[PDB]
Subunit: 201 residues, 2 copies
């Protein structure tokens, strides 16, 4: 980029304890499960116009607002989060019939000012993101258990009331100045109508 | 489509306090500083046969043992760490020559079995390393302050006597049940003869 500081919405996912239990698997099985997961997530991210910034062991870092931004960056991110979780049921049917146990995934989303641009060397430049707001997203993701999406207050305000919420948690990770409230996502309303649990008729 | 489980030495570095300091810089300055630092670190790493796995907003993952191994990767990893700290003095001449605060860097090194393989998308897939022992090296490094290299004892045992150590510390990082002993590296002996203070 050469360097810009701007509001974006950052999403990060991780596979709640797959690090640990992968130690039991043959190396081809670890790689296969991970490719099935990554391939499937990459489909949902792309459908929602996110930028896969990086694949990090069993984690994914995604940007909405960089290289290009829109008015609904935060909405698209939340909708992407919910559909990522729902796409995991599918990957879990496959992983499960490979004879392996299902994956569980946690997701954190934060919206804020970050530095974006091309970071790296000669033979290896990387489109990168730097700042406190990046780290806070990882930290938010950390409170999550399997199947959950936690989002900060700035992502909820930025996304709007089409984001449906079960409730909040107030946290303060190591070296954070004041507590942050994070929001437990249930689903997104019109025009997405994506839900983690079905509204029972 | 798959890969291999094998013992490798993994090195990770971090620009201590930089995320926080970057929040005061102009964005052209943040990118330039990263690029000066990565440019030179990549030089040092390449000179030592390290494989650069990833670059992060203030960070490097390096591997000694993937996709090519040999038995004293571990000493060469520690030597590389020592040269990285020393090379930071040149990046700082340029960084401070722009009137900008000097970087400090911490580094963690660990030796263990990981899974390595080709991983990610159906399209632009990178070379990846997975396992607890990757995460351990990031834990090890989180205890570092500017100018300091911390190594696991498996790394010190693989590398041997030519790693000179300032002293020991035993930590219990969360998640992992047993405490790891970590070593404060002062320098390395023949043939590198590189020292940190």
């Amino acid at each position: 980029m050469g360097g810009d500081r701007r509001p974006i919405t950052i999403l990060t996912s991780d596979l709640r304890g797959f690090t640990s239990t992968s130690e039991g698997l043959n190396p081809e099985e670890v790689v296969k499960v991970l490719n099935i997961y990554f391939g499937k997530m990459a489909d949902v991210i792309t459908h929602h116009g996110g930028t896969i910034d990086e694949f990090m062991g069993d984690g994914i870092l995604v940007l909405f607002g960089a290289p290009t931004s829109q008015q609904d960056d935060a909405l698209r991110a939340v909708a992407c989060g919910v559909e990522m979780q729902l796409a995991l049921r599918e990957v879990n049917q496959q992983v499960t019939g490979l004879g392996l146990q299902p994956l569980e995934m946690g997701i954190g989303i934060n919206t804020g000012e970050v530095v974006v641009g091309n970071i790296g060397s000669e033979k290896r430049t990387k489109y990168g993101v730097v700042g406190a707001q990046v780290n806070l997203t990882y930290r938010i993701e950390s409170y999550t258990t399997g199947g959950q999406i936690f989002i900060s207050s700035t992502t909820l305000e930025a996304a709007g009331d089409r984001v449906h919420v079960n409730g909040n948690r107030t946290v303060q990770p190591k070296g954070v100045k004041d507590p942050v409230v994070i929001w437990d996502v249930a689903g997104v309303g019109e025009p997405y109508n994506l839900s983690l649990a079905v509204e029972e008729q």
